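User: Can you help me understand a structure? I only have the sequence.
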Amino acid sequence: IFGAIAGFIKNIW
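Assistant: Let's start by predicting it. Here is the structure, written out as tokens:
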């Protein structure tokens, strides 16, 4: 599960 960081970082920002 590597990418949810950019998914939540982009979804949040």
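Now, to help you interpret it: The first helix runs from residue 4 to 12. The helical segments are 4-12. Let me know which part you'd like to focus on.
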